[PDB]
Amino acid sequence: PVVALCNTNTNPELVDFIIPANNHQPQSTCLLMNLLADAVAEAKAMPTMFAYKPDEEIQIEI
Amino acid sequence: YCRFCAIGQLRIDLIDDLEALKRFLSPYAKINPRRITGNCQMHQRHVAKALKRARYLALVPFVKD
Amino acid sequence: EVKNDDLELALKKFKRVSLEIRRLAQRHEYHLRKGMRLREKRKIAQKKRRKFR
Amino acid sequence: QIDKNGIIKSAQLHDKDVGSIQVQVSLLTSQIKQLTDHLLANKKDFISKRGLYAKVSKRKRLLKYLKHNDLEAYRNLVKTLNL
Amino acid sequence: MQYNIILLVDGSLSLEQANQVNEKQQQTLTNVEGLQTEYLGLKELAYPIKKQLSAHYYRWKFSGDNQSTKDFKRTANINKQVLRELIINLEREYGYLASINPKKQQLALQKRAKYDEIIARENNPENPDVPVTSGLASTQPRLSRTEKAQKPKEELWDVVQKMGNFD
Amino acid sequence: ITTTKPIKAHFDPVADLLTKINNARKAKLMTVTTIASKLKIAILEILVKEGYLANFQVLENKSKTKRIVTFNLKYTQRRIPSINGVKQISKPGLRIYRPFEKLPLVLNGLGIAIISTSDGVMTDKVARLKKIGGEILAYVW
RNA sequence: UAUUAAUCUAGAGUGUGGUAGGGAGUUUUGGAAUUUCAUGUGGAGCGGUGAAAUGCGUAGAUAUAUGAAGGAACACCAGUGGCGAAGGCGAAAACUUAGGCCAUUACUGACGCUUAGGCUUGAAAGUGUGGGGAGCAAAUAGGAUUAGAUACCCUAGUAGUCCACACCGUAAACGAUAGAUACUAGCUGUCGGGGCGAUCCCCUCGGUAGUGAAGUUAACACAUUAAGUAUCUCGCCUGG
């Protein structure tokens, strides 16, 4: 299998696990990537960073 | 932009707006393309017919070079 | 033609309008049929649309 | 001109029916009378002849439908002779 | 129906003779005379008509029967004192219904919108803002009544797990 | 409920309802509306009470002029249609009948069919049980 | 299912209101333009070709100002335009009129699809009667092309090329999709009506266009104007 950050208009039949969130814009992609990294980071006995911290994420573009 | 799609004068003849017809008239007594009239079909055919009307009545020259 | 009052701007206008006149003349020295007429009419329409689109 | 407003009120069975069969056949025969003169005037207006063929075919269909379903289908013959 | 008639005069003659010949042409009408008397002064033609350069243009509009037109056609052409013969009944696309004409506000909106009075106003057409009337009533309502009782089912998306038990 | 749009019978009851079944099976939809008819009522109820599609309702307008029926098809969370193919052997101009001895089976282990002999709708198994032959509606699988 | 008596409107038409379109014919004209004939200007060339020839040319050619005569087609708006059963329909009208479209909350009630037979038109050419031959140009001739010029260009020129009567019915008369009732992903551009309501867009009923799912077709490719799944009626295919 494989999981996909499913942007709308994509084929759902190819994908097996659907993540319906924006990915063309970076402001959502950064948060989603950080969340999935935190989800996978528990395997190392290394504590998570986000999803439990009240501090807001960073975003810088120009 | 079209002068005639926005006001809705609903009738075209020689004494509705003759100076508008002159503005629509070319410098060489012709008819301007779609890029000037600002519309596609119906006010355009109206003004073309009216310019022909005045042409037959000799309100604007057939040719003027 | 008219409007010859500038050394070169009027010249540019004159040459452009004369090129238009020549193109309008190009369809008036040979024989053609109605279907052929519709053919170059559609071709010119498509070419101008590609010029603008 | 056919003057529909003047002929609608002359073949009716009620005071509100406007789509009855009798008013339909009256309209059809009025069109026949008008367009016969029109075609005998203009002998090359063939689209008009096709349209007249269409209305006469429709009138024949209506007459057949009446003569099939309803016995009372010959009031319009005694006033305007047909067939 | 109503008609629109344009009439011409020969040469640069006086105005009284023009009115007289206009009146003479008017009596040609078969049964109905609802003439309107006005003229466009004097305008110089851009090209000669027969041999002249200027003439008087007169206008008429009456409401009568359609037979009042052919007589003018064989009379005006016979009269050598006319130069043009425009005769239009009504058949250019026209509207007079009293539900569309009361819309001249556009013009009232137009000039003020485009008139330049302050250096701060910046406007350009072809701009969408979608003013809302809050109600259209164009929905074609059709209600129904149920006559049998059965139970429907809810639907979700086809979420598939590839055996989910590799452990 | 209150679809607020008109529907009409297309050409003929049997093929009219089979067209909507075709639409259901190919478009992978849920609810399809159509007009009502006693034959369609009977076939829908015999088809649903044997467990082959979802439920359906019969509806009527404000005035006693028109009766319509909508129908739903059984589906699964796995998104699998319950119908694989429908085909009518009888068609306008071809009304073929069978006797009891020659009753056409329908891929015996799988298929379902309706035979209108004399009493509305009877499925193939009860048709054999009563030993009566009639007019075969269509094959569904 | 037939057969049947009465039925009820959504099928289907008719009325009402709005709206659109080079739809058809008839009758009047207008322009620029070509050709020709004239009145003045001028003197050796003018008209054609990968290069040259036929032809015209002091009985002032060409060019050039004006006039006069006349036959055909209606530049310009004319577009991814609109109607038309098909072909087609573009200068201006008046007339008789033809079919739509949209809300049809009105009217009647199955009258609706097809229809081999029978009729209505029919791109062009040609045929037989009147105008005209202004331009055009099959055929014929003359001059060059190559062994060859009945064709390839130039000069004229034969009827026809239009308007009226009677024909003849063939077109690659093409969307190479017979004609109607259903439904089905979307997306974009574009014409009309309704309300909305400056143009700008929001929807609905519709037609005209591309893009492109499943699905289909051998493939190309088709798709909300099916070649998809259905169904109905007339025709055609059984090898050149």
D68/D60 Cα distance (integer angstroms): 12
Q: Which method, experimentally, gave rise to this model?
A: cryo-EM
Nucleotides of G under 7 A from a protein CB: 1, 8-11, 13-32, 75-81, 84-86, 88-99, 104, 106-108, 110-112, 120-122, 136, 165-166, 180-185, 190-192, 194-204, 214-215, 228-233
Q: How many CB atoms lie within 10 A of CB E15?
A: 12
- D25 CA → G212 C1’, Å: 51
CB contact under 8 A, E162 and A16: yes
As beta bridge partners, residue F89 has none
Three-state secondary structure call for residue D32: helix
What token pair was written down for F68?
């319509």
Is the distance between the Cβ of E78 and the closest atom of strand G smaller than 7 Å? Answer: no
B63/E5 Cα distance (integer angstroms): 26
Nearest-CA distance F80 → chain E (Å): 9
Three-state secondary structure call for residue E85: coil
Is the distance between the Cβ of D55 and the closest atom of strand G smaller than 7 Å? Answer: yes
**Nucleotide at minimal C1' distance from the D44 CA:** G25
Q: Which domain holds residue D36?
A: 1-83
Three-state secondary structure call for residue C15: helix
CB F81 within 8 A of CB F28: yes
CATH code for the part of the protein at E4-88: 3.30.70.60
Cβ-in-10-Å burial (0-12, 13-18, 19+) of F121 comes to: buried
Span between the terminal Cα atoms of chain C, in Å? 31
Domain count, chain D: 1
Q: The sheet that has F122-123: what strands, in order across it? A: F86-87, F135-140, F112-116, F122-123
Chain F residue with minimum CA distance to E161: F78
Interface of E with B in 24-63 (CB under 8 A): 43, 45-47, 49
Cβ-in-10-Å burial (0-12, 13-18, 19+) of F43 comes to: buried
> Where is F137: in which H helix or E strand?
strand F135-140
Residue labelled with tokens 């009284």: E16
CB C1 within 8 A of CB B65: yes
E106/B6 Cα distance (integer angstroms): 7
As beta bridge partners, residue E43 has E55
Is the distance between the Cβ of F110 and the closest atom of strand G smaller than 7 Å? Answer: no
Residue E115 neighbours by CB under 8 Å, 6+ apart:
none
Report how far Cα E14 is from the mean position of its chain's Cα atoms. 36
- E167 CA → G196 C1’, Å: 63
Q: What is the resolution of this structure in A?
A: 5.3
Cβ-in-10-Å burial (0-12, 13-18, 19+) of F24 comes to: buried
Is the distance between the Cβ of B22 and the closest atom of strand G smaller than 7 Å? Answer: no
F60/F63 Cα distance (integer angstroms): 8
E151/F74 Cα distance (integer angstroms): 12
Q: How many CB atoms lie within 10 A of CB F85?
A: 11
Is the distance between the Cβ of E130 and the closest atom of strand G smaller than 7 Å? Answer: yes
What token pair was written down for E124?
């350009």
Strand E57-60 to strand E4-8: parallel, antiparallel, or no bridges (unpaired)?
Answer: antiparallel
Q: Which of E49, E84, E92 sits opposite B49 (nearest CB)?
A: E92
- F13 CA → G4 C1’, Å: 21
D31/D57 Cα distance (integer angstroms): 13
CB B29 within 8 A of CB B62: yes
Count Cβ–Cβ pairs < 8 Å, chain E vs chain F. Answer: 57
B6/E125 Cα distance (integer angstroms): 10
What token pair was written down for E156?
């979700």
Sign of CA dihedral F123, F129, F132, F133: positive
